[PDB]
């Protein structure tokens, strides 16, 4: 049987890596894109999510502790059986979404409006009740921009919370034996704080390391600059997860900088809004120029949507507000993202990822 957690690197090119994470509920091919799931990947059955190539999905913790409730999901058998996805699930720790969507912050945790608390201990407990396979430490995503003083204080708190997260996880035998725990690096855009955060997380020890605090308004140039120095600070032999990223070009550049795992609502959310990804760049299917276009969304995509329906039909559906429009757009977009990850993995494996990145950009931004 598979181990609780094993990450193996099969091939490398520069800072880019390709390999596998083996967990009890399945193998995750890296670099990986993880579709974002209120206990559903919006508009898709789990079998459709899997058919697009996804190895792991993300459970929506902040949504789930509010509705339907973590204790309720546990009573019903856990998130996997509740939603019908039997493969790995990664759950965020909830603080980012509390500070984004809900607040009273303290060293103990965060209280927020129905009133609720989240602390490192309660966050880890909720993720256990959901049955998460990859548990995220409870952190604070520092707003951008941040002064050096405030970034330092925030990062220092996150590192204290990272230790509390580790200890809460380890003190729950069933969780420690069956799930994995990732720590989250903070420090805003400042190299010295990113180094201090990486050192603190490595001293505690985690199964994987996320780069937190990015994709919060800084823009791609600055994000890439921070990744340039931040990713090498993390343990090389563990997975690197860039939280909240992102657009196809952001993924390609992040892989060039050593990132192994990605999550974003862009393919799902923007799909329902009419944006379809293609190898020639995104298109907005609502545009009148597609009303009589019999071509599929993308000329090369292997997804079931591009095998069966035209741009003209999907244009009509989205303009009419039809649910099937959201279903088809989302399946195509998630499938496109997975095909992107497959091309990334194969090109690294073949030592031609730098050429792939150049070719991808030349066509995507032509």
Ligand X SMILES: CNc1nc2c(CC[C@H]3O[C@@H](OC)[C@H](O)[C@@H]3OC)c3nc(N)[nH]c(=O)c3cc2[nH]1
* Residue numbers at the binding site for Zn ion (CB under 5 A): 301, 303, 305-306, 332
- For residue 242, list its beta bridge partners: 211, 262
What's the farthest any 2 CA atoms get from each other in the chain?
61
Distance CA 278, CA 250 (A): 15
Active site residue 236: no
Q: Does residue number 309 form part of the binding site for a copy of itself (CB under 8 A)?
A: yes
290 CB neighbour count, 10 Å cutoff = 23
Distance CA 226, CA 224 (A): 5
Enumerate the H helices of the chain as residue ranges.
46-51, 61-66, 70-75, 79-83, 95-101, 120-130, 148-170, 173-178, 191-204, 220-230, 248-256, 266-272, 304-308, 311-319, 323-349, 353-364
The minimum distance between CB 143 and ligand X, in angstroms, equals 10
Full DSSP string of 99-111: HHH--EE-SS-EE
Distance of CA 32 to the CA centre of its chain: 9
Out of 92, 250, 260, 298, the active site residue is: 92
On whether the CB atoms of residues 315 and 306 are closer than 8 A, the answer is no
The minimum distance between CB 139 and ligand X, in angstroms, equals 5
36 binds, among a copy of itself, ligand X, Zn ion, none (CB under 5 to 8 A by kind): ligand X
Residue closer to Zn ion by CB (options 124, 306) is: 306
Residues 6 or more apart whose Cβ sits within 8 Å of residue 328: 305, 309, 314, 317
Q: Does residue number 308 form part of the binding site for a copy of itself (CB under 8 A)?
A: yes
DSSP 36: B
The three-point CA angle 13-349-34 to 5° equals 95
Residue closer to a copy of itself by CB (options 44, 242) is: 44
Out of 55, 133, 207, 263, the active site residue is: 263
Could you tell me how many residues make up the chain?
A: 366
327 binds, among Zn ion, ligand X, a copy of itself, none (CB under 5 to 8 A by kind): a copy of itself
Distance CA 257, CA 343 (A): 17
The minimum distance between CB 249 and Zn ion, in angstroms, equals 19
Residue closer to ligand X by CB (options 244, 253) is: 244
216 binds, among a copy of itself, ligand X, Zn ion, none (CB under 5 to 8 A by kind): ligand X
Site track 326-355 with a copy of itself (rule: CB under 8 A), x = hit: xx----------------------------
301 binds, among Zn ion, ligand X, a copy of itself, none (CB under 5 to 8 A by kind): Zn ion
- Using CB under 6 A, list all residues that contact ligand X: 36, 58, 60, 92-93, 95-96, 136, 139, 141, 184, 212-213, 215-216, 243-244, 263
Active site residue 263: yes
Binding-site positions for substrate read 92-96, 139, 186, 213
| Residues annotated catalytic, as ranges | 92, 263
Using CB under 8 A, list all residues that contact a copy of itself: 38-40, 42-45, 67-68, 72, 75-77, 82-84, 291-292, 294, 308-310, 312-313, 316-317, 319-320, 322-324, 326-327
């Amino acid at each position: 049987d598979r181990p609780r957690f094993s990450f193996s690197i099969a091939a490398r090119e520069g800072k880019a890596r390709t390999g596998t994470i083996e967990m009890k509920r399945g193998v995750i091919r890296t670099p990986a894109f993880m579709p974002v799931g209120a206990a559903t990947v919006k508009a898709l059955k789990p079998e459709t999510v899997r058919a697009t190539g996804a190895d792991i999905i993300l459970g929506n913790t902040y949504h789930l502790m509010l509705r339907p409730g973590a204790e309720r999901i546990a009573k019903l058998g856990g998130l996997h059986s509740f939603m019908g996805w039997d493969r790995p699930i990664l759950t965020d720790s909830g603080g980012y979404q509390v500070m984004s969507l809900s607040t009273k912050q303290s060293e103990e945790g965060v209280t927020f409006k129905s009133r609720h608390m989240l602390s490192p201990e309660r966050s880890i407990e909720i993720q256990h009740l959901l049955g998460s396979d990859i548990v995220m430490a409870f952190d604070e995503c520092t707003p951008y921009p941040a002064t050096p003083s405030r970034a330092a204080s925030s990062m220092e708190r996150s590192m204290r919370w990272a230790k509390r997260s580790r200890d809460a996880f380890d003190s729950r035998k069933e969780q420690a034996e069956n799930a994995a725990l990732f720590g989250i690096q903070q420090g805003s855009v400042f190299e010295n704080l990113r180094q201090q955060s990486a050192d603190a997380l490595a001293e505690i020890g985690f199964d994987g390391y996320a780069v937190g605090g990015l994709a919060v308004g800084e823009g791609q140039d600055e994000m890439f600059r921070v990744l340039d120095f931040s990713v090498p600070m993390l343990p090389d032999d563990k997975p690197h997860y860039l939280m909240g990223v992102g657009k196809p070009d952001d993924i390609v550049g992040a892989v060039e900088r050593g990132i192994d795992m990605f999550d974003c609502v862009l393919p799902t959310r923007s799909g329902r809004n009419g944006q379809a990804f293609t190898w020639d760049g995104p298109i907005n299917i609502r545009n009148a120029r597609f009303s009589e276009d019999l071509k599929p969304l993308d000329s090369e995509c292997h997804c079931a949507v591009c095998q069966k329906w035209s741009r003209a039909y999907i244009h009509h559906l989205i303009r009419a507000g039809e649910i099937l429009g959201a279903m088809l757009m989302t399946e195509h977009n998630i499938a496109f993202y997975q095909q992107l990850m497959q091309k990334i993995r194969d090109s690294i494996s073949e030592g031609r990822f730098s050429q792939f990145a150049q070719d991808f950009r030349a066509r995507y931004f032509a």
